[PDB]
Amino acid sequence: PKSMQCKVILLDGSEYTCDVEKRSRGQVLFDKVCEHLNLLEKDYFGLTYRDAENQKNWLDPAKEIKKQVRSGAWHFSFNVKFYPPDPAQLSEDITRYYLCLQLRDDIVSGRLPCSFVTLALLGSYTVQSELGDYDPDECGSDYISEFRFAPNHTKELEDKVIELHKSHRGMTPAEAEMHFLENAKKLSMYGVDLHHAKDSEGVEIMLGVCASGLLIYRDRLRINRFAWPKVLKISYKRNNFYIKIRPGEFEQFESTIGFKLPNHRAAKRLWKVCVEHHTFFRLL
Numbered sequence: 001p002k003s004m005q006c007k008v009i010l011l012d013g014s015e016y017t018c019d020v021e022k023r024s025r026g027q028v029l030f031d032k033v034c035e036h037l038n039l040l041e042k043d044y045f046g047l048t049y050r051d052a053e054n055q056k057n058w059l060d061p062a063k064e065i066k067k068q069v070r071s072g073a074w075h076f077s078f079n080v081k082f083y084p085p086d087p088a089q090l091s092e093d094i095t096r097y098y099l100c101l102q103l104r105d106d107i108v109s110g111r112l113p114c115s116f117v118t119l120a121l122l123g124s125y126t127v128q129s130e131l132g133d134y135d136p137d138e139c140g141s142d143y144i145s146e147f148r149f150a151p152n153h154t155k156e157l158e159d160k161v162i163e164l165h166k167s168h169r170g171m172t173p174a175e176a177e178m179h180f181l182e183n184a185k186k187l188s189m190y191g192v193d194l195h196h197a198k199d200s201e202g203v204e205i206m207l208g209v210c211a212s213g214l215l216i217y218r219d220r221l222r223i224n225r226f227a228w229p230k231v232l233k234i235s236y237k238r239n240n241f242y243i244k245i246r247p248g249e250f251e252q253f254e255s256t257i258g259f260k261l262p263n264h265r266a267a268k269r270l271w272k273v274c275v276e277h278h279t280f281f282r283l284l
């Protein structure tokens, strides 16, 4: 039995290495990673890989790994796939912990925009979780944390993290992580997967996929939202992505909204993430 070496970037930035039989399905590798992580609430998570274009793809657990990575290295990342709308309802602290690590990367990367005060508050809960109670001995008037809190760090942000950290004395790691999530979950881009597209007039938009539905970001004044209930059918053909928007009461016919994606693979990817979100958040 011939086995292939897999390398997985974990959410703390460390590398897990294992071997799977070369015809293994994605679920086999995912089960090994989740066992390594002591993670039971596995349904929220998945593995990604980067293609020759360094674009992110979800590894389909039901399909052979080799038929997805194809020509590429067996190199993956462990990521949150379905962001829980209410992390307080997860059954395990360790689930909330991995969700926090993913969100920290969402923030530092700039995928999850955040006000100054929310960056500082989130940063303060991470410090409380990671180091425990504020200690003046490690922090002078010139302190800069090892923790990455933001896409662009300022001394002002470092000071505000410390000021809020002082207020959390006695807070346990699970408590600070729950506070982190209660704040992060409210952010307008929480759990939103963004895809570049053109509308039917060739005007550049973003499509966001999240628990509550599909978001069309036209301009700052024009943001259309289609709750999953309002979406009857999702389709792709060539470079095009289509959604069927339900008849509103007393209307005879569904409406169709068409989008142009960069290429066929980008249309397919968007279609599959929409179907998966529609299924997952229908089970809520």
Ligand SMILES: C[C@@H](Cc1ccc(Br)cc1)C(N)=O
Pocket (backbone or CB within 6 Å): 212, 213, 214, 215, 225, 226, 227, 228
């Ligand atoms: C109406 C409310 C909830 C909602 C509904 C549909 C989507 Br897609 C996203 C959010 C909102 N404007 O945030």
